[PDB]
Amino acid sequence: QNCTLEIESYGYTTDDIEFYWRGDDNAVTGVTKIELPQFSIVDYKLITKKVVFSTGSYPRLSLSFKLKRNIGYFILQTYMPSILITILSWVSFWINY
Amino acid sequence: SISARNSLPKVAYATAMDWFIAVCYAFVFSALIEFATVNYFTKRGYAWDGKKTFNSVSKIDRLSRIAFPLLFGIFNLVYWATYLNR
Ligand SMILES: CCCCCCCC(=O)OC[C@H](COP(=O)(O)O[C@@H]1[C@H](O)[C@H](O)[C@@H](OP(=O)(O)O)[C@H](OP(=O)(O)O)[C@H]1O)OC(=O)CCCCCCC
Ligand SMILES: *[C@@H]1O[C@H](CO)[C@@H](O[C@@H]2O[C@H](CO)[C@@H](O[C@@H]3O[C@H](CO)[C@@H](O)[C@H](O)[C@@H]3O)[C@H](O)[C@H]2NC(C)=O)[C@H](O)[C@H]1NC(C)=O
């Protein structure tokens, strides 16, 4: 997945305010020590841009992650019972006609 | 196995109860595979009437009457002693 956080200024345009990440890539810390039970944060990326609405152009900092889902829970719950219940279906070939 | 994997978070690893569930799944299948082998090695389509050549009691049945309960008994003495202590 690609989950984003969209930081933006509401009332002040780019003529009234300016946004920047303080410290470049050393501006968002503590990401690597986050532990999720079913996901794993592969990468995070920081974007500085401007968006143009009808009322003007506003600054925007976009913070985003790259969550990758762990597989072994779904192997333990969904895939392997379906595999075993499919192996059970071919027991019937050995029973007499 | 499906209902036991509820009201706990979706962790990637396998708990002790999941190991117990795998061993029990195996013991309930090896039993099914044992019956499949017995039915592969069966012969006539008539049972004993209590009074022709009739079927015999399978040697796989007489071994699994002893080996399957003891191997589950050995597993319980291993599993419950290892985790209750830890
Ligand atoms: C999951 C385990 C799978 C094991 C698969 C093991 C598969 C395997 O090896 O089968 C062969 C044999 C089958 O024996 P079983 O008693 O089931 O079958 C008899 C056997 O075939 C005799 O030879 C037959 O007499 P005959 O000669 O025709 O006159 C007799 O016919 P009838 O006299 O009634 O007409 C048959 O009923 O089993 C063992 O020797 C015990 C193995 C125990 C192995 C360990 C089991 C825990
Ligand atoms: C998750 O999704 C977001 C949004 O789709 C990704 O952000 C995008 O990242 C690329 C790579 O940095 C950006 O392209 C760059 O744009 C700048 C603009 O000046 C340009 O100078 C660079 O040469 C490059 O082309 C892209 O703009 C950006 N998307 C938006 C809407 O800003 C992100 O990479 C994805 N992955 C992660 C791990 O976050």
Curated annotation (Swiss-Prot), chain A:
Location of the protein in the cell: Postsynaptic cell membrane; Cell membrane; Cytoplasmic vesicle membrane
Binding site for 4-aminobutanoate: Y10, T55
Annotated TM spans: 71-91
Annotated glycan sites: N2
Tissue: Isoform 1 and isoform 2 show reduced expression in schizophrenic brain. Isoform 3 shows increased expression in schizophrenic and bipolar disorder brains while isoform 4 shows reduced expression.
Binding site for histamine: S9, Y10, T55
Residues on Cytoplasmic side: 92-97
Disease: Epileptic encephalopathy, infantile or early childhood, 2: A form of epileptic encephalopathy, a heterogeneous group of severe childhood onset epilepsies characterized by refractory seizures, neurodevelopmental impairment, and poor prognosis. Development is normal prior to seizure onset, after which cognitive and motor delays become apparent. IECEE2 is an autosomal dominant condition with variable age at seizure onset, ranging from early infancy to 6 years.
Primary role: Beta subunit of the heteropentameric ligand-gated chloride channel gated by gamma-aminobutyric acid (GABA), a major inhibitory neurotransmitter in the brain. GABA-gated chloride channels, also named GABA(A) receptors (GABAAR), consist of five subunits arranged around a central pore and contain GABA active binding site(s) located at the alpha and beta subunit interface(s). When activated by GABA, GABAARs selectively allow the flow of chloride anions across the cell membrane down their electrochemical gradient.
Family: Belongs to the ligand-gated ion channel (TC 1.A.9) family. Gamma-aminobutyric acid receptor (TC 1.A.9.5) subfamily. GABRB2 sub-subfamily.
Annotated domain remarks: The extracellular domain contributes to synaptic contact formation.
Assembly description: Heteropentamer, formed by a combination of alpha (GABRA1-6), beta (GABRB1-3), gamma (GABRG1-3), delta (GABRD), epsilon (GABRE), rho (GABRR1-3), pi (GABRP) and theta (GABRQ) chains, each subunit exhibiting distinct physiological and pharmacological properties. Interacts with UBQLN1. May interact with KIF21B. Identified in a complex of 720 kDa composed of LHFPL4, NLGN2, GABRA1, GABRB2, GABRG2 and GABRB3.
Protein name as annotated: Gamma-aminobutyric acid receptor subunit beta-2
Taxonomic source organism: Homo sapiens
Encoding gene per record: GABRB2
Curated annotation (Swiss-Prot), chain B:
All ranges on the Extracellular side of the membrane: 6-15
Record field: transmembrane: 16-37, 63-82
Localization (cell): Postsynaptic cell membrane; Cell membrane; Cytoplasmic vesicle membrane
Domain of life: Eukaryota
Note: Functions as a receptor for diazepines and various anesthetics, such as pentobarbital; these are bound at a separate allosteric effector binding site.
Family, as annotated: Belongs to the ligand-gated ion channel (TC 1.A.9) family. Gamma-aminobutyric acid receptor (TC 1.A.9.5) subfamily. GABRA1 sub-subfamily.
Disease annotated for this entry: Epilepsy, childhood absence 4: A subtype of idiopathic generalized epilepsy characterized by an onset at age 6-7 years, frequent absence seizures (several per day) and bilateral, synchronous, symmetric 3-Hz spike waves on EEG. Tonic-clonic seizures often develop in adolescence. Absence seizures may either remit or persist into adulthood.
Assembly behavior: Heteropentamer, formed by a combination of alpha (GABRA1-6), beta (GABRB1-3), gamma (GABRG1-3), delta (GABRD), epsilon (GABRE), rho (GABRR1-3), pi (GABRP) and theta (GABRQ) subunits, each subunit exhibiting distinct physiological and pharmacological properties. Interacts with UBQLN1. Interacts with TRAK1. Interacts with KIF21B. Identified in a complex of 720 kDa composed of LHFPL4, NLGN2, GABRA1, GABRB2, GABRG2 and GABRB3. Interacts with LHFPL4. Interacts with NLGN2. Interacts with SHISA7; interaction leads regulation of GABAAR trafficking, channel deactivation kinetics and pharmacology.
Domain notes: The extracellular domain contributes to synaptic contact formation. The GABA-binding pockets are located at the interface between neighboring alpha and beta subunits.
Described function: Alpha subunit of the heteropentameric ligand-gated chloride channel gated by Gamma-aminobutyric acid (GABA), a major inhibitory neurotransmitter in the brain. GABA-gated chloride channels, also named GABA(A) receptors (GABAAR), consist of five subunits arranged around a central pore and contain GABA active binding site(s) located at the alpha and beta subunit interface(s). When activated by GABA, GABAARs selectively allow the flow of chloride anions across the cell membrane down their electrochemical gradient. Alpha-1/GABRA1-containing GABAARs are largely synaptic.
Name of the featured protein: Gamma-aminobutyric acid receptor subunit alpha-1
Provenance organism: Homo sapiens (Human)
